[PDB]
């Protein structure tokens, strides 16, 4: 009878497994039409409509988190197992600059063995662009046995998380008060999870990754490198590489932290041997992060007369312009899972995009900057994940507004005041979007039409009307001057992208000053415009989710509904879901432009080879500066030019990329059937098909119905995203692996 | 094992098992007799 | 603070009526409440009722009727909606005969009733050029 | 026709036209559509029952 | 011969294709070492390529001017193994599938809960019906004769 | 204190009294503009608006036109001046047609009172209704407004061309 | 304004009237059904065409039918 958990709440039985739709009150009666099947999967994780108790929803969410973490652990275990058994990691360790990472071999069936490429190191397989080899090398993993043991540990951890989810749904489910301890949860997630994870990783780096990687960079082969445990039992194997361990932990406890400058450095730049960040800098960074997060975890009052109450902090932040201020926000975020999901997903996607930027900007792994496929894939993948997560955060903000928003509890607070002037916000955001689009894109079109008319001096180019990004160049200058002036204890700039020397590893450029000209001005304003339009769609969905001048009772129709009818001139897509659908489209557009800008700019003005005398030759040859300013330039010198490797991949080991290119084109075009058409035509065609089936006595008892309007839109957008992202995926991968 | 066998009798599990078996015997026919453009007879 | 004492304690929203409800028509909903309950405006956000006479103006009949439907959740039933033309031309709209349209009242005649099902409608080709 | 009888729907604008249903009750009052028929197949709106006139239903032998 | 094509056994371009593929595979084989699994895999690829080309040559297959086997599907039994025999095989298999599906639909259509037995298959009855589809050509031309294959006027029709 | 309140004590208007809509700075600044400055005939309002608009309109045409010159060119100035004048002509055409299709009044601030007093049982929209009581809201008022806009636009464009020439020559 | 017609298949279940967002439909006495009531459309000038009325109709092919016609500021749902 614990005060935090309920014991044996749900019986572990297979009876409900044999009753599909048991969770829903409407679906429990059984299918009558094929719409029931689709409704079954669309409501599976909508725990809000399955129970009327916040406690039950919270418990379901907790167990679902455990299942998701078990799935993630299984995926990581699979990655490590493939590295251990079906990879050339050992060969890549001895030749990182000449062996391509491969960790998946393809069975010899139907002639598909051509996919096993010549990745080097007496190996055949698919080249890997996830950068696991570089990460494992940065971890100090020098043998495939360690990868096998990490895979075994991942399997054990996945089983543990599965057992935890089962235990906390069926044997000991926490109570609502336990879930609502946001102060305790924040304290623990900030100190324990974040800070202690940073501290543990700093310890691992210092004791395992720092010596092993230093020996690897010195040229010591992985076979004669001591086993990682020997660096702990023997204080002399690590004190030779870093002659500060001879003093032990006495400098730490005597506040003489200057003695540890051997392995806790602040250098900046990149390791000249590997092209990645100095691992001493990384260890010092993780140590500082650990201390900062542990300190930050002692902020909120949990169980003693010590710390802050988030309710008292929010309620004190009022103002003349904001009425009641943040009063009621604590109740909103402690009684609505959707609001927490909105905030967490938005910040999580933004964090993913920031991670993507800082990855290529400052390569943190050895021999990852010179693996161009890995860098391109990591950036594009993380930016895509960030965009999807941001759209999801907007969607769940809209869901909270529709479902969990209480008008009485939010009288004259920030949420109320935002809804009260939603018109002004949306109208000014509309004006900003029109201004930004007009300018950015019409400058592009003006360049295109001036070039087409033979007026080269009328373009918005560097040798013409020039739009120099002076503000960004000022920041670039400030960073390259930071070491010794504003960061006096730095030896080198944080990233060579801001300026400095060309860093090359094995005649391949790792990082180099990224010059910003009029071409970068236009593409940056294109990014701003696309982001603003996506924000416009999502914010219009969130703010007008409850009511509008069209439908004053839109909240009574729910978050997900197709329309209110053909009246009022037509009330299609007025939902808030139909705004997360359009916003998904615009996020695809924005992220596609972002990754295109990254790919072309890097290939044209960063990546390449360096001659022995210091001459820099890039992959494309600097065509970004003069040919990325017109739409015809993007079509020809980027799309047409770099699509050559994809279309000429047939018969080679990259033929799978051409096949996926074609299939993604097919899927993207397939989406337009659902996006352009309507439900009535398909229902009436199914009518004649059903007539034929009845004529042959083969009409199913479950009456076949065309997909609902909302499901038709969802299928269309899912296929559109899959096709477009897969086309860009195949194009990028084939292009950057070939060259 | 009365409701577990009923769960295995559901449409998704049965379709997954049948399609896995179908792809399996197709792939194995194509392994043991590969590159079959015409009827063997 | 407000023009009239019977107005709900609303802080004003940029979702109210526009120049249309000054030269074409405006709609007013009146009701009496026992408690100063906090309710959501059909246009903007949260407003506070008056413990007594309450009067609200809107640009559409649908907005007033949505507010009235919300009022039913507060056990408020005596709400009445009027249409005001550009001058003070008041016309009672929603409780037209004092009884809600969902309840049958004597004195109502059927309007738009056809004495046949859908299948009895005339063929469009016979309804050409009239 | 009576309760439990099987009838064929003769109404053309019906989701169950030419199909067979089960009569739930035949009203004896002066209503226009007294015959209430229950069907196994739900229509597009989800309902599985409807009131029919005496000349819009034909009893199955 | 038929349509101006020639047998692949006497098509020079066919042998050129075989030689070029084998040469590419051997050049790939040259860059690996000893009896290592990559060399074994490439050698198996070479052997399979040679076997496939030899089988296509000795298969009554007509090759065009590009040295690729062309299919003669006009209906002649001479090239009957290209389309006609696979056509019969597919017709048998697909008729089996359709027959067992229709039989299952009609069988569980006369139970108390026909819709339940469509998402939750009656595996015993399903297995009973599925292995009975080998007589689908005979069953179809024994149910059509009895009038049990086709509905007549209980089928629904739209308004016009 | 609260700096946002319902506009004119009406919580049902689609408007708010923010520190921008109803600030003393906003009041004075909009009351010194020609469109709202007291004591101006519609012709004077149009003339001032046209002068300012032609003055700032000649700029972009001369600077970024198809016949630019990094040095001073009489042809570039003439091209910019002609483009600005033709744009003012297009704007004046728009003003003329807008006034033609919008108003049917020759003397406002009275007809409203006449139909509020002596009844307006007519086809309405001319006797009754009548949006706005300004002198700019009449057929005569808008015609003189357009005339002033057009004349002032020409004069201001010429003045700005002269100023541009003087600045480019003597500086 | 749109056109709304009521047909004698009406069973007087009132679901159309209580679904109208603009108070167009009302229940009037009748003698053609058990409930003794039939829907009426006496205020079609307020009809917006949202067709919520016939989404709540349980009769087989509807007893209330909305025919979209000429548009008006009331029928277009214009708050401006
Ligand atoms: C969750 C991530 C993940 C993914 C995507 C894969 C994917 C793959 N694994 Mg794999 N694997 C994983 C986790 C994963 N594994 C884990 C956690 C382990 C440790 C137990 C393994 C152990 C493993 C072995 C030992 C082998 C594979 C093989 C394969 C490949 C063929 C799979 C196949 O045909 O099975 C078909 C499965 C079914 C029909 C069952 C239904 C495929 C690329 C095979 C391979 O690459 O062959 C060369 C192979 O031999 N995997
Ligand atoms: C063998 C162990 C076992 C058994 C018999 C049960 C039995 C039950 N669970 Mg349970 N559960 C288990 C393990 C088990 N659970 C574990 C390990 C977890 C943690 C993840 C949970 C979490 C959990 C929650 C949160 C809920 C249940 C519920 C239920 C009840 C209904 C389940 C149902 O119909 O959905 C059967 C569903 C499936 C078989 C789907 C499996 C989904 C997997 C995880 C997806 C993996 C696919 C993978 C990612 C690849 C995708 C491509 C039933 C009593 C529900 C309940 O009682 O509320 C009414 C409920 O809300 N369970
Ligand atoms: C220092 C203590 C501590 C630590 C380390 C964590 C760590 C975590 N919590 Mg958690 N939590 C804590 C205290 C702590 N919590 C307290 C005190 C409360 C009560 C307010 C909660 C309430 C809570 C909820 C409601 C949820 C979490 C979730 C999570 C996970 C977030 C997912 C993630 O980042 O993946 C990082 C993943 C890893 C690093 C994998 C290794 C982590 C393992 C499992 C260690 C977990 C520590 C655990 C608390 C020890 C208990 C053991 C048990 C025998 C008592 C993460 C594993 C979320 C989640 O995913 O649910 C499962 C979630 O929904 N926590
Ligand atoms: C932490 C992440 C997270 C979580 C927990 C949720 C959770 C939820 N979301 Mg949500 N969402 C997210 C991210 C997340 N979402 C993101 C990133 C987006 C933007 C795209 C959305 C957009 C979104 C919408 C628009 C809606 C939800 C809804 C829901 C609720 C019901 C979900 C459900 O039943 O789906 C069950 C799961 C499925 C139906 C799976 C569908 C399969 C997907 C679409 C295709 C995946 C393809 C995959 C990549 C493989 C393709 C490869 C190909 C070759 C085969 C639930 C509370 C719905 C709701 O009603 O909320 C109350 C709703 O309407 N969400
Ligand atoms: C190439 C196709 C295309 C184009 C041009 C646009 C353009 C636009 N969309 Mg988009 N959209 C598209 C495809 C496209 N969309 C698709 C496929 C979808 C489906 C998901 C959407 C969904 C969508 C939504 C949901 C929203 C937009 C919005 C916008 C507008 C953003 C504001 C802006 O930049 O206006 C400026 C106009 C342009 C940049 C277009 C070119 C104008 C030129 C360059 C300058 C002016 C030329 C000049 C006037 C020509 C005069 C001569 C002529 C008379 C002969 C803009 C009009 C948002 C909106 O309403 O605006 C805020 C919005 O909310 N779109
Ligand atoms: C479900 C369909 C199916 C069928 C009919 C067969 C049939 C066969 N398999 Mg098999 N197999 C299948 C699926 C299937 N397999 C799957 C999904 C896997 C995992 C990817 C394997 C892995 C496998 C191996 C590893 C071997 C067979 C072998 C065999 C043969 C002897 C047993 C036989 C022809 C054996 C054989 O003939 O090889 C000599 C053998 O060694 N199979
Ligand atoms: C829909 C049109 C179509 C048709 C007619 C074919 C026909 C063929 N394909 Mg093919 N294919 C198609 C679509 C099609 N494919 C698509 C869409 C793809 C992309 C995924 C492929 C990818 C593909 C590959 C990669 C390969 C083929 C191969 C083959 C040939 C060998 C078939 C086989 O395994 O027989 C043997 C198997 C059977 C006859 C199964 C039936 C046996 C049952 C159990 C008999 C039992 C009853 C007695 C055959 C000519 C193979 C080949 O050799 O090409 C010449 C080959 O390597 N195809
Ligand atoms: C298995 C039973 C079955 C049978 C006997 C038929 C028979 C027929 N269908 Mg059909 N159909 C079925 C299932 C079936 N269908 C399913 C499951 C779907 C949904 C995808 C469709 C969708 C469909 C369409 C859209 C059309 C037909 C059409 C037709 C007719 C012409 C043949 C054709 O085009 O094939 C069409 C076959 C397919 C599109 C693929 C069917 C998918 C699989 C192979 C069938 C399902 C197998 C099932 C799971 C087996 C379970 C039984 C087991 C438990 C015992 C013919 C009356 C056409 C027509 O009206 O022409 C007169 C037409 O336009 N059907
Ligand atoms: C940026 C302007 C800014 O954030 O100043 C801050 C300004 C000050 O508001 P308050 O003093 O009332 O805020 C006090 C508490 O609400 C703390 O949030 O907020 C606004 O007035 C919002 C108006 C946005 C107008 C967009 C331009
Ligand atoms: C085709 C179409 C239909 C009909 C589509 C239907 C009935 C979907 C049928 C799906 C089948 C029955 C199952 C899926 C079969 C696929 C082969 C499985 C997916 C492939 C896997 C690899 C995922 C609609 O209902 C619709 C509704 C609204 C707008 C547009 C449309 C629309 O375009
Ligand atoms: S069906 Fe399509 S069009 Fe007709 S109302 Fe619903 S959404 Fe608008
Ligand atoms: S459309 Fe249907 S619902 Fe909307 S008002 Fe007219 S009748 Fe009532
Ligand atoms: S909808 Fe049809 S049934 Fe429901 S009330 Fe109106 S008329 Fe009677």
What DSSP assignment string belongs to A550-614?
A: S-TTGGGG-SS-SBS-S-TT--BT-SSSHHHHHHHHHHHHHHHHHHHHHHHHHHHHT-EEE-TTS
Type and span of the H or E element at A174: strand A172-174
CA distance G61 to chain D (A): 6
SS3 assignment, position A237:
coil
State whether A408 and C46 contact (CB < 8 Å). yes
DSSP state of A26: T
Residue with tokens 């304004």: G1
Going by alpha carbons, the residue nearest to atom 51 of ligand 4 is A722
| CB-count burial class (<10 Å; 0-12, 13-18, 19+) for F148 | buried
Tell me if G58 sits within 8 A of G13, measured CB to CB: yes
User: Is residue D44 within 8 angstroms of chain E, CB to CB?
Assistant: no
**What number of residues does chain E have?**
160
Q: Of C3, C11, C17, which has the smallest distance from its Cβ to F14's Cβ?
A: C17
Work out whether the CA dihedral A184, A190, A193, A195 comes out positive or negative. negative
Alpha-helical regions (H) of A362-467: 372-403, 414-420, 422-452
User: Facing residues of C53 across strands?
Assistant: C32
Q: Are A503 and A277 a contacting pair, CB within 8 Å?
A: no
Dig out the tokens for C30 from the structure: 């009146």
Structure tokens at A203: 């310890």
Angstrom distance (rounded) from CA A472 to CA A478: 10
C8: alpha, beta or left? (left if phi > 0; alpha if psi -120 to 50): beta
CA of A577 to the centre of ligand 11 (A): 15
Of C47, C36, C51, C42, the closest CA to residue A410 belongs to: C47
The Cα E27–Cα E146 span in angstroms is: 67
Instruction: Measure G57 CA to nearest chain A CA, in Å.
Output: 15
The torsion defined by the Cα of A36, A38, A43 and A49, in degrees rounded to 10, comes to -30
Query: Measured between CA atoms, how close is A89 to chain B, in angstroms?
Result: 30
The answer to whether the beta carbons of residues C16 and C64 sit under 8 Å apart is no
Of A466, A259, A271, A453, the C-alpha closest to A362 is A271
Residue A209 tokens, joined? 């990754």
What CA–CA distances, in Å, run from A528 to A473, A495, A532, A591, F116? 18, 24, 6, 11, 54
Q: Which of A712, A720, A722, A721 is nearest to A42 (CA)?
A: A712
User: Do residues A553 and C42 lie in contact, with contact meaning Cβ atoms separated by under 8 Å?
Assistant: yes
Name the token pair of A132. Answer: 């696991």
Sign, CA torsion G50/G56/G60/G65: negative
Beta-carbon contacts of residue D43 (< 8 Å; ≥ 6 apart): D15, D16, G60
C102 backbone dihedrals φ, ψ, rounded to 5°: -75, -20
Find the closest chain G residue to C43 by CA distance.
Answer: G79
Burial class (CB in 10 A: 0-12, 13-18, 19+), A65: middle
Nearest CA to A629 among A460, A516, A463, A456? Answer: A460
H or E element at residue A216: helix A210-217
Phi, psi of B29 (to 5 degrees): -60, -45
User: Using an 8 Å Cβ cutoff, are A560 and A708 in contact?
Assistant: no
Sheet of E6-7, strand order = E6-7, E62-63, E69-70
In the numeric block, which tokens belong to residue C29? Answer: 């909903």
Evaluated on CA atoms F95, F96, F102, F104, the torsion sign reads positive
The tokens describing B22, both together, are 């179908």
Chain F contact for A428 (CB, 8 A cutoff): no
**How many angstroms separate the CA atoms of A185 and A302, rounded?**
9
The dihedral through the CA atoms of C43, C48, C54, C55 has a sign that is: negative
Q: Which of A205, A255, A254, A251 is nearest to A231 (CA)?
A: A205
Relative to beta strand D49-52, strand C26-32 is unpaired
E14: number of CA atoms within 13 Å, CB side? 23
Residue E115: burial class (beta carbons within 10 Å; 0-12, 13-18, 19+): buried
Cα gap A372→A510, rounded to integer Å: 9
Give CA–CA dist C75/A415, Å, rounded. Answer: 27
Closest atom of ligand 9 relative to the A323 alpha carbon: 12
**Distance, CA of A57 to chain centre:** 26
Alpha helices in chain C (DSSP H): 20-23, 61-72
- The DSSP secondary-structure symbol of E146 reads T
Q: Which of A399, A417, A406, A715 has the alpha carbon at shortest distance from A541?
A: A399
DSSP character for A333? H
Resolution in angstrom units: 3.1
Ligand 6 shell residues, CB under 6 Å: B 21, 24-25, 28
Q: After which residues are there C–N gaps above 2.5 Å in chain E?
A: none
Phi/psi zone of residue A697: left (φ > 0), alpha (ψ -120 to 50 degrees), beta? Answer: left
Residue D17 · residue D10 · CB < 8 Å: yes
A357 CB within 6 A, ligand 9? no
What the block records as the tokens of A714 is 């969802």
What 3-state class would DSSP assign to A277? coil
Q: Residue A32: list chain D partners with CB under 8 A.
A: 42, 46
Asked whether the beta carbons of D14 and E159 are under 8 A apart, the reply is: no
Q: Are A183 and A311 in contact (CB under 8 A)?
A: no
Degrees (nearest 5) of the Cα angle A508, A510, A511? Answer: 135
**Rg of the Cα trace of chain B?**
16
Distances (CA, A) of C69 to A399, G26, G40: 22, 16, 20
Q: Percent helix, strand, coil in chain D (nearest 5)?
A: 0, 40, 60
Contacting residues for F127 by C-beta, under 8 A, at least 6 apart: F111, F114, F115, F120
How many Å apart are CA A583 and CA E22, to the nearest integer?
A: 52
> In terms of C-beta density within 10 A (0-12 exposed, 13-18 middle, 19 or more buried), how is residue C107 classed?
exposed
What tokens does A449 get? 């039409």
Backbone torsions φ then ψ of C14, nearest 5 degrees: -80, 50
The single-letter DSSP state of residue E67 is S
Chain B contact present for E56, CB below 8 A: yes
Best of D33, D42, D56 to mutate (most G CBs within 10 Å, chain G): D33
- Work out the burial of residue A293: count CB atoms within 10 Å of its CB; fewer than 13 is exposed, 13-18 middle, 19 or more buried: buried
Q: What is the DSSP letter of C8?
A: -
- Which positions in chain C touch F16 (Cβ < 8 Å)? 12-14
Helices and strands of chain D, counted as H and E runs: 0, 5
Q: How far apart are CA E17 and CA A653, in angstroms?
A: 19
The residue of chain E with its CA nearest to that of A651 is E21
Tokens of A393: 């955060």
Q: Look at the block and give the residue holding tokens 């079906």.
A: A86
CB-CB contact of E88 with E106 (8 Å): no
SS3 per-residue string spanning A359-392: HHHCCCCCCCCCCHHHHHHHHHHHHHHHHHHHHH
Using CA atoms, how far apart are residues C69 and A565, in angstroms rounded to an integer?
Answer: 19
The CA distance from A308 to A316, in Å, is 12
Pair G59, G3: CB distance under 8 Å: no
**CA separation (Å) from F18 to E11, F3, F83?**
88, 6, 40
Cβ proximity of A143 and A106 under 8 Å: no
Strands (E), A58-107: 102-104
What tokens were used for F73?
A: 């060119």
How many whole angstroms separate alpha carbon E81 and alpha carbon E86?
A: 7
Query: CA separation (Å) from A197 to A131, A200, E131, F104?
Result: 22, 5, 59, 77
Q: Which residues pair with D35 in a beta bridge?
A: D26, D52
Distances in whole angstroms, Cα of residue A655 to Cα of each of A345, A376, A517, A659, F96: 37, 20, 37, 6, 66
> Which tokens sit at A622?
């600097």
Report the C-alpha gap between C111 and A546 in whole angstroms. 34
**Residue A393: CB partners within 8 Å, gap ≥ 6?**
A341, A342, A343, A344, A345, A346, A347, A348, A349
> Do residues E69 and E90 make contact, with C-beta atoms less than 8 angstroms apart?
no
CA angle F73, F79, F85 (to 5 degrees): 135
Distance CA F113, CA A589 (A): 57
Return the H-helix or E-strand segment holding A314.
helix A310-315
Whether A563 contacts A345, CB under 8 Å: no
Give residues preceding each break in chain C, C–N over 2.5 A.
none
Please give the DSSP secondary-structure letter assigned to residue A190. I
Task: Report the SS3 class of residue E63.
Answer: strand
Q: How far is A268 from A484, CA to CA, in rounded Å?
A: 12
Among E45, G23, C76, CA closest to A107: E45
Residue A207's nearest CA partner among A263, A274, A276 is A263
Helix segments in A453-508, DSSP class H: 470-480
B/e letters for A619-637, b = 16+ CB within 10 Å, e = fewer, are bbeebbbbbbbbeebbeeb
Take atom 6 of ligand 11 and give the residue whose Cα is closest. A563
Q: How many CA atoms lie within 13 A of A209 on its CB side?
A: 25
What distance in angstroms lies between residue B11's CA and the mean position of ligand 10's atoms? 17
- For D17, phi then psi, to 5°, come to -60, 140
Rounded to whole angstroms, how far apart are CA atoms A225 and F102?
A: 89
Token output for E57: 């040559």
Distance (Å, rounded) from C-alpha A557 to C-alpha C95? 25
Residue that has been written with the tokens 């199909």 in this structure: D19
Query: Which pairs from E111-117 meet CB under 8 Å and 24+ separation?
Result: E113/A30, E114/A701, E115/A30, E115/A31, E115/A32, E115/A701, E115/A702, E116/A30, E116/A31, E117/A701
| Distance between start and end Cα atoms, chain C | 59
Give the number of the ligand closest to the Cα of residue A42: 4
Q: Sign of dihedral through CA atoms C33, C39, C45, C50?
A: positive
Cα A41 to averaged position of ligand 4 atoms, centre (Å):
10
């Amino acid at each position: 009878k614990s005060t935090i958990v309920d014991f044996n709440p749900v019986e572990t039985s297979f009876e409900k497994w044999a009753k599909p739709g048991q969770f829903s009150r409407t679906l429990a009666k059984g299918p009558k039409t094929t719409t029931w099947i689709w409704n079954l999967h669309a409501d599976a994780h909508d725990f809000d409509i399955q129970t009327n108790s916040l406690q039950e929803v919270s418990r379901k969410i907790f167990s679902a988190h455990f299942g998701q973490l078990a799935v993630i652990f299984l995926w990581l275990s699979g990655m490590h197992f493939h590295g251990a058994y079906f990879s050339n990691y050992s060969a890549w360790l001895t030749n990182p600059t000449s062996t391509k990472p491969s960790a998946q071999i393809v069975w010899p069936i139907v002639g598909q063995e051509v996919l096993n490429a010549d990745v080097g190191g007496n190996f055949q397989g698919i080249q890997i662009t996830s950068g696991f080899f570089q990460l494992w090398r940065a971890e100090g993993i020098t043998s495939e046995v360690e990868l096998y043991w990490t895979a075994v540990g991942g399997l054990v951890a996945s089983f543990l998380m599965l057992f935890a989810g089962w235990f906390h749904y069926h044997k000991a489910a926490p109570k609502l008060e336990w879930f609502q301890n946001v102060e305790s949860m924040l304290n623990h997630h900030l100190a324990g999870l974040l800070g202690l994870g940073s501290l543990s990783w700093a310890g691992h780096q210092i004791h395992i990754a720092l010596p092993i990687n230093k020996l690897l960079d010195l040229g010591v082969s992985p076979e004669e490198i001591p086993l990682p445990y020997e660096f702990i039992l023997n204080r002399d194997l690590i004190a030779q590489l870093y002659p500060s361990f001879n003093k032990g932990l006495t400098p730490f406890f005597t506040l003489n932290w200057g003695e540890y400058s051997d392995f806790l450095t602040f250098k900046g730049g990149l390791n000249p041997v590997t092209g990645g960040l100095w691992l001493t800098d990384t260890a010092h960074h993780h140590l500082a992060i650990a201390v900062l997060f542990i300190v930050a975890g002692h902020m909120y009052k949990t169980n003693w007369f010590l710390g802050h109450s988030i309710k008292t902090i929010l309620e004190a932040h009022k103002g003349p312009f904001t009425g009641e201020g943040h009063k009621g926000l604590y109740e909103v975020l402690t009684t609505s899972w959707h609001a927490q999901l909105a905030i967490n997903l938005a910040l999580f996607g933004s964090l993913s995009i920031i991670v993507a930027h800082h990855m290529y900007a400052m390569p943190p792994y050895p021999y990852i900057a010179i693996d161009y496929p890995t860098q391109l894939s990591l950036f594009t993948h993380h930016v895509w994940i960030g965009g999807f997560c941001i759209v999801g955060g907007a969607a769940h903000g809209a869901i909270f507004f529709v479902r969990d928003y209480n008008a009485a509890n939010n009288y004259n607070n920030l949420i109320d005041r935002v809804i009260r002037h939603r018109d002004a916000i949306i109208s000014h955001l509309n004006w900003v979007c029109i201004f930004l689009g007009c300018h950015s894109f019409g400058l592009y079109v003006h360049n295109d039409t001036m070039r087409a008319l033979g007026r080269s001096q009328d373009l918005f180019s560097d040798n013409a009307i020039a739009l120099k990004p002076i503000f960004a160049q000022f920041i670039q200058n400030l960073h390259t001057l930071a070491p010794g002036s504003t960061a006096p204890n730095a030896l080198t700039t944080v990233s060579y992208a801001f300026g400095g020397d060309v860093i090359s590893v094995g005649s391949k450029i790792a990082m180099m000053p990224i010059s910003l000209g009029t071409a970068d001005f236009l593409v940056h304003h294109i990014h701003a415009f696309t982001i603003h339009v996506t924000v416009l769609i999502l914010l219009k969905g969130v703010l007008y989710s409850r009511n509008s001048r069209l439908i004053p009772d839109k909240a009574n129709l729910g978050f997900r509904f197709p329309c209110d009818g053909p009246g009022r001139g037509g009330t299609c897509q007025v939902s808030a879901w139909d705004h997360v659908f359009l916003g998904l489209f615009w996020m695809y557009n924005s992220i596609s432009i972002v990754i295109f800008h990254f790919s072309w700019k890097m290939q044209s003005d960063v990546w390449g080879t360096v001659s022995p005398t210091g001459a820099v030759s890039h992959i494309t040859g600097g065509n970004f500066a003069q040919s990325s300013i017109t739409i015809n330039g993007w079509l020809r010198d980027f799309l047409w030019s770099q699509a050559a490797q994809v279309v000429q991949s047939y018969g080679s080991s990259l033929s799978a990329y051409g096949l996926i290119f074609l299939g993604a084109h097919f899927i993207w075009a397939f989406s337009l059937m659902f996006l352009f058409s309507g439900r009535g035509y398909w229902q009436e065609l199914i009518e004649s098909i059903v007539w034929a089936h009845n004529k042959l006595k083969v009409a199913p008892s479950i009456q076949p119905r065309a997909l609902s309007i909302t499901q038709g839109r969802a299928v269309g957008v899912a296929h559109y995203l899959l096709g477009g992202i897969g086309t860009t995926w195949a194009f990028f991968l084939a292009r950057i692996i070939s060259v | 094992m009365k409701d577990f066998l009923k769960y295995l009798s559901t449409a998704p599990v049965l379709l997954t098992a049948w399609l896995t078996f179908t792809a399996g015997f197709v792939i194995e026919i194509n392994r043991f007799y590969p590159d079959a453009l015409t009827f063997p007879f | 603070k407000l023009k009239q004492s019977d107005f709900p304690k609303f802080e004003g929203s940029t979702g109210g009526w526009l120049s249309a409800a000054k030269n074409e028509e405006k709609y007013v909903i009146i009701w009496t409440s026992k408690d100063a309950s906090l309710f959501e405006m059909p246009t903007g956000g949260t407003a506070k009722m008056n413990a007594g006479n309450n009067v609200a103006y809107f640009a559409r009949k649908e907005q007033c009727l949505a507010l009235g439907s919300q009022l039913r959740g507060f056990k408020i039933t005596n709400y009445k909606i009027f249409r005001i033309y550009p001058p003070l031309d008041i016309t009672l709209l929603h409780p037209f005969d004092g009884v809600f349209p969902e309840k049958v009242n004597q004195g109502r005649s059927p309007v738009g009733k056809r004495d046949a099902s859908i299948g009895g409608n005339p063929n469009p080709a016979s309804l050409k050029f009239q | 026709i009576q309760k439990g009888s099987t009838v064929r729907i003769l109404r053309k604008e019906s989701y169950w036209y030419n199909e067979s249903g089960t009569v739930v009750v035949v009203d004896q009052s002066k209503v226009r559509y007294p015959v209430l028929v229950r069907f196994t197949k739900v229509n597009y709106a989800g309902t599985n029952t409807n009131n029919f006139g005496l000349n819009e239903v034909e009893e199955v032998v | 011969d038929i349509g101006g094509l020639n047998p692949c056994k006497d098509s020079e371009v066919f042998q050129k294709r075989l030689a070029k593929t084998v040469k590419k595979l051997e050049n790939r084989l040259k860059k690996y070492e000893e009896g290592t699994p990559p060399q074994i895999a490439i050698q198996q690829q070479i052997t399979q390529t040679k076997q496939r080309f030899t089988r296509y040559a000795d298969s009554n297959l007509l090759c065009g001017n590009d040295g690729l086997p062309h299919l003669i599907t006009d209906g002649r039994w001479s090239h009957g193994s290209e389309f006609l025999l696979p056509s019969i095989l597919f017709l048998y298999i697909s008729g089996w599938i359709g027959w067992v599906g229709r039989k299952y639909i009609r069988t569980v259509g006369q139970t108390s809960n026909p819709t339940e037995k469509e998402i939750i298959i009656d595996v015993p009855l399903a297995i009973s019906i599925m292995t009975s589809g080998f007589l689908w050509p005979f069953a179809a031309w024994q149910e059509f004769l009895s009038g049990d294959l086709i509905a007549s006027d209980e089928t629904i029709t739209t308004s016009p | 204190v609260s700096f946002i309140k319902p506009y004119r004590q009406d919580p049902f208007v689609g408007h708010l009294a923010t520190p921008i809509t109803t600030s003393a700075f906003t009041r004075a600044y909009l009351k010194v503009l020609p469109a709202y400055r007291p004591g101006l005939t519609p012709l004077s309002r149009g003339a001032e608006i046209g002068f300012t608009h032609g003055y700032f309109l000649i700029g972009p045409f001369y600077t970024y036109g198809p016949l630019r010159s990094v040095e001073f060119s009489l042809t570039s100035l003439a091209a910019g001046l002609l483009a600005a004048i033709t744009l003012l002509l297009i704007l004046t055409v728009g003003l003329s047609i807008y006034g033609q299709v919008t108003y049917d009044v020759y003397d406002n601030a009275l007809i409203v009172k006449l139909v509020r007093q002596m009844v307006g049982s007519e086809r309405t929209q001319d006797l009754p209704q009548i949006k706005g009581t300004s002198e700019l809201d009449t057929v005569l008022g808008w015609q003189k407004f357009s005339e002033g806009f057009f004349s002032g636009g020409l004069i201001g464009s010429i003045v700005a061309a002269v100023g541009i020439a003087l600045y480019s020559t003597y500086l | 304004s749109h056109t709304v017609k009521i047909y004698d298949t009406c069973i007087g279940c009132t679901q159309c009237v209580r679904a109208c967002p603009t108070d167009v439909l009302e229940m009037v006495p009748w003698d053609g059904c058990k409930a003794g009531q039939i829907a009426s459309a006496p205020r079609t000038e307020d009809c917006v065409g949202c067709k919520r009325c016939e989404t709540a109709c349980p009769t087989d092919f509807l007893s209330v039918r909305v025919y979209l016609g000429g548009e008006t500021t009331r029928s277009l749902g214009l708050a401006y």
